[PDB]
Design an enzyme around this catalytic site. Structure first.
Site, mmCIF file in Angstrom:
data_model
loop_
_atom_site.group_PDB
_atom_site.id
_atom_site.type_symbol
_atom_site.label_atom_id
_atom_site.label_comp_id
_atom_site.label_asym_id
_atom_site.label_seq_id
_atom_site.Cartn_x
_atom_site.Cartn_y
_atom_site.Cartn_z
ATOM 1 N N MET D 55 0.814 -1.215 0.000
ATOM 2 C CA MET D 55 0.000 0.000 0.000
ATOM 3 C C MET D 55 0.850 1.268 0.000
ATOM 4 O O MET D 55 0.508 2.255 -0.661
ATOM 5 C CB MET D 55 -0.939 -0.037 1.212
ATOM 6 N N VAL D 58 2.081 2.256 -3.673
ATOM 7 C CA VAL D 58 1.000 2.822 -4.483
ATOM 8 C C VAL D 58 0.818 4.311 -4.192
ATOM 9 O O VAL D 58 0.753 5.139 -5.105
ATOM 10 C CB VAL D 58 -0.309 2.041 -4.265
ATOM 11 N N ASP D 59 0.727 4.659 -2.911
ATOM 12 C CA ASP D 59 0.704 6.046 -2.425
ATOM 13 C C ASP D 59 1.937 6.894 -2.760
ATOM 14 O O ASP D 59 1.810 8.119 -2.874
ATOM 15 C CB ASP D 59 0.532 6.049 -0.911
ATOM 16 N N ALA D 60 3.115 6.308 -2.943
ATOM 17 C CA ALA D 60 4.340 7.113 -2.959
ATOM 18 C C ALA D 60 4.379 8.133 -4.104
ATOM 19 O O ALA D 60 4.662 9.313 -3.870
ATOM 20 C CB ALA D 60 5.558 6.195 -3.032
ATOM 21 N N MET D 63 1.545 10.887 -3.831
ATOM 22 C CA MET D 63 1.892 11.851 -2.788
ATOM 23 C C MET D 63 2.942 12.876 -3.217
ATOM 24 O O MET D 63 2.925 14.013 -2.727
ATOM 25 C CB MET D 63 2.328 11.110 -1.530
#
Lengths: 57, 75, 101, 75, 75
Positions: D55, D58-60, D63
């Site tokens: 998870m 995916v966010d990196a 962001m």
């Protein structure tokens, strides 16, 4: 039942519904089956073949 | 003049699309990783190794667009 | 290599350690390489191809049955005669006919 | 003067692409996690620690695009 | 004026689109590999080498879009 070469006994045993033979494991996690086509149809064929197997035995 | 904002927004579009490519590429790779784990937990310590190599390539192009988006902000 | 057993209710058709096989599953062809994934499926009537370890390729006809797989041990539970719900329903009627007599 | 407004606009599109990228990516990844839990409820704490290894990646990239979106908001 | 300002708009948007393609695509192809590895781990070497062949073709078209994206950035 052919208990021995020298001795045998008449028996009545229930083949359906399936007896609750304990058959307890956790190693199913480690290899779990791909159900093709689907699980339920496979399970019906197993139950039907299993009954035929016990009758022949 | 306005041309200073339109060269900034050029970084903004480069960042925007590249972020979707990398996020969903990693997410689909990751979703099938969980199907491998769902069948067979003893595989998951192996599967983390091969996942990280394949995820490495998924970044390789988007990370170029990330850096150029940072440079085009400063320049 | 893996330990394969092909069995039927009356007799055990074949067994031993094996390099690979090709099998006609209910949905399509399947190849069991060394250490293949766990699997359960019904298999269709026909020849299946064995290559025993040290490469001895062979054909076994099966009238059908069930395939199961797990990486170290694999087995096929073969039927003896062609199985069909319609054919078995015909046998069920045949069985009743005798009862009347 | 248009310089100010179009900088506001450039953040808003860049922000929407990053919001979609993250929300869809972890939605997909989370769906396979819930399939694993329904299939295999003994392992759900193990799968939970796997799902959170994935998870964060995916966010990196989304962001980062939020970080530039907030800087173009701020400046 | 406008020719050089819009030069920023083109190279950035081309790489943004190419970063989508080159990361969605091998993410999809990544998930099927990582599943195939979880299916048949004796063939993780064979699948990984097979997977590299397929990936190289996927990258080929997107790499040229970064190539033109830098050539417009340099010139």
């Amino acid at each position: 039942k052919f208990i021995n070469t020298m001795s045998q006994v008449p028996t009545i045993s229930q083949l359906l519904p399936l007896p609750a033979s304990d058959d307890d494991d956790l190693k199913h996690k480690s290899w779990d089956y791909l159900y093709e086509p689907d699980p339920k149809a496979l399970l019906d064929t197993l139950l039907r073949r299993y009954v035929e197997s016990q009758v022949y035995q | 003049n306005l041309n200073m904002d339109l060269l900034y927004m050029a970084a903004a579009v480069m960042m925007g699309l590249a972020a979707i490519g990398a996020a969903i590429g990693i997410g689909i790779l990751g979703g099938k990783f969980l199907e491998g784990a769902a069948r067979q937990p003893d595989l998951i310590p192996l599967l983390r190794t091969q996942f990280f190599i394949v995820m490495g390539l998924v970044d390789a192009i988007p990370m170029i667009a990330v850096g150029l988006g940072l440079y085009v902000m400063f320049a | 290599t893996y330990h394969l057993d092909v069995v039927s209710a009356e007799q055990q058709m074949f067994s031993g350690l094996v390099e690979k096989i090709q099998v006609t599953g209910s949905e399509g062809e399947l190849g069991i390489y060394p250490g293949h994934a766990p699997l359960l499926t019904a298999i269709k009537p026909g020849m299946i191809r064995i290559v025993k370890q040290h490469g001895h390729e062979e054909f076994i006809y099966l009238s059908g049955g069930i395939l199961e797989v797990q990486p170290g041990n694999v087995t096929v539970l073969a039927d003896t005669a062609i199985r069909g719900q319609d054919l078995d329903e015909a046998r069920a009627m045949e069985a009743k006919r005798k009862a009347e007599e």
